[PDB]
Design a protein around this ligand. Structure first.
Ligand SMILES: NC(=O)c1ccc[n+]([C@@H]2O[C@H](COP(=O)([O-])OP(=O)(O)OC[C@H]3O[C@@H](n4cnc5c(N)ncnc54)[C@H](OP(=O)(O)O)[C@@H]3O)[C@@H](O)[C@H]2O)c1
Ligand SMILES: O=C(CCc1c[nH]c2ccccc12)Nc1c(C(=O)O)cnn1-c1ccccc1
Ligand SMILES: [Co+2]
Ligand SMILES: [Co+2]
Length: 159
């Protein structure tokens, strides 16, 4: 089973200049829970946005998409096609915008957390994929973070 997990603003933005433009500690403990134990696929630019410390993410098989045939990620498997990356039964694609859009044609699940911030879509932004009518989803209640931000959780499934 192949799924995608991302945090977005209402507009669709997920990253900006190598970073996520917010701080949602509760999502860290939610993201860690859903991915812990399995394989995680990220693109190279996303693998680079992680602090050296938490690189690689403990307890998980870190897989990095890249076209650089020489690119070495200390502690992660470097492949060159997502077909190469997608080999484990339960795999979670964790970013970024380029990888999310490449993987969705092949996911049965999506774990979305939407942050309530008024964040305009600047050119060159990393965006969240778009889900059509083929996606039946469940929504949770709006919650309120130790950061001071309202957010709600979305789970989608494709039969
Ligand atoms: N929850 C969130 O809000 C969230 C989650 C994760 C990341 N982000 C943000 O997302 C942003 C970056 O995402 P991005 O979309 O700009 O870059 P990305 O998707 O993170 O990875 C981009 C890299 O993936 C590799 N790649 C792309 N297509 C490929 C293919 N078909 N085969 C092999 N390798 C391929 C390339 O690496 P080479 O150039 O090495 O080939 C490309 O440079 C950052 O700002 C990050 O913080 C946010
Ligand atoms: O906090 C998160 C989640 C943030 C996040 C949401 N979607 C993502 C997609 C790709 C990469 C990270 C995210 N992960 C973890 C962990 C963990 O998962 O165990 C440990 N440290 N960190 C961390 C701490 C500070 C800054 C960054 C990462
Ligand atoms: Co699990
Ligand atoms: Co199903």
């Amino acid at each position: 089973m192949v799924g995608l997990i991302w945090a977005q603003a209402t507009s669709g933005v997920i990253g900006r200049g190598g970073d996520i433009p917010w701080r949602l500690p509760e999502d860290q403990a939610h993201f860690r829970e859903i991915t812990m134990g399995h394989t995680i696929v990220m693109g190279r630019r996303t693998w680079d946005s992680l602090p050296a410390k938490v690189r690689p993410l403990p307890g998980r098989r870190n897989v990095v998409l890249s076209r650089q045939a020489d690119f070495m990620a200390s502690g992660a498997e470097v492949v060159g096609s997502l077909e190469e990356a997608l080999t484990s039964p339960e795999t979670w694609v964790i970013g970024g915008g380029q990888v999310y859009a490449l993987a969705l044609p092949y996911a049965t699940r999506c774990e979305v957390t939407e942050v309530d911030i008024g964040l305009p879509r600047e050119a060159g932004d990393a965006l969240a994929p778009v889900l059509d009518e083929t996606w039946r989803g469940e929504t949770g209640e709006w919650r309120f973070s130790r950061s001071g931000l309202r957010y709600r959780l979305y789970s989608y499934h494709r039969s």
